[model samples]
Target: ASKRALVILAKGAEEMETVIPVDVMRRAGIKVTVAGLAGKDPVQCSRDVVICPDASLEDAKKEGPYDVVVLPGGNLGAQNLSESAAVKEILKEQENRKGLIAAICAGPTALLAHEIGFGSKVTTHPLAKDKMMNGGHYTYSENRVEKDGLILTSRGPGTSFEFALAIVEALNGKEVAAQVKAPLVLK
Candidate 1:
């Protein structure tokens, strides 16, 4: 059976972080749905790139039980996600179902906001660490990609592919991850 993925797209989201994973996951043959946190319109990214989401979050919520819920990071984007009650509910539901949650850069801070993966070993962009560590609720790692149980996270846009491939590995397996990475000519 095919796997499904949901990428929560928010205003000011890092374009590379959002695009890379969506593109790479499609390469891995996952059915990806990029859901807009700011309604169904195109969002202006952190660097001013605008991307149209596949659907609004309200609509996408009705279609989930996804293999993974991915969070792409930008300071404002992650903040938007952290502030949304809809996002809180989505993360809580995915956690309750034991589905995968993948975040990168400041993205993991949204997990912190929702208390989605407390006590899980996770990571964030070096600059985003303090917010992620507030109150000692979780342990942090410096790995490009860190996986503790079902929560997968990575450092920043520079590590987006690693973060994305980690999600593929979790959902598909090492063989599929390797197969998908080979064609990218990554170092």
Candidate 2:
């Protein structure tokens, strides 16, 4: 079966974290959907990068049960994700089904907000560590990418490639992830 990923794009998302995983997953032959949280329109990222979503989140949710649900982070982006009732429902449903859920940078803070994956070892951008650990719900790590079972997380833009490849390896396989990684010449 083919793998599909849904990347939720809200206002103020980290462009690098959002784009890298979507691009890398596609390279690994995964079908990826960049969905807009508000509507099918261009979203202005944290650094002012604008990205046009493939569909509105409401529309994408109807098509899902995706293989993976990805959350890309910026402080404001995570806030938007955290505050969304739609996002809460999606995460809860995905969790109930035991589907893969990947988040990066401050993105995991959204997980904290939704009360998902409690007790899983996780990591987030250094700046987001305290927030992610607010109630000591989960243990923290300094790894560039951390995957505790189905909850996958990474630190920041610098680790986006590793993070994406981790998702590739999880859904596809290590061989495909390696093949997709080689051409990039990542150190």
Q: Report the backbone clash tally of model 2.
A: 0
TM-score of each: 0.98, 0.99
* Model 1, CA-based lDDT: 0.94
Error of 2 at 6 (Å): 0.4
User: Each candidate: how many clashes?
Assistant: 0, 0
Tens digits of lDDT, candidate 2, 1-187: 7899999999999999999999999999999999999999899999999999999999999995899999999988999999999999999999889999999999999999999999999999999999999999999999999999999999999999999999999999989999999999998
The residue-by-residue lDDT of candidate 1 on 47-134, one tens digit each, is 9989999999999999848999999999899999999999999999999999999999899999999998899999999999999999
**How much does candidate 1 score in TM-score?**
0.98
Alpha carbon lDDT at 132, candidate 2: 95
Which segments of candidate 2 are over 4 A away from where they belong?
A: none
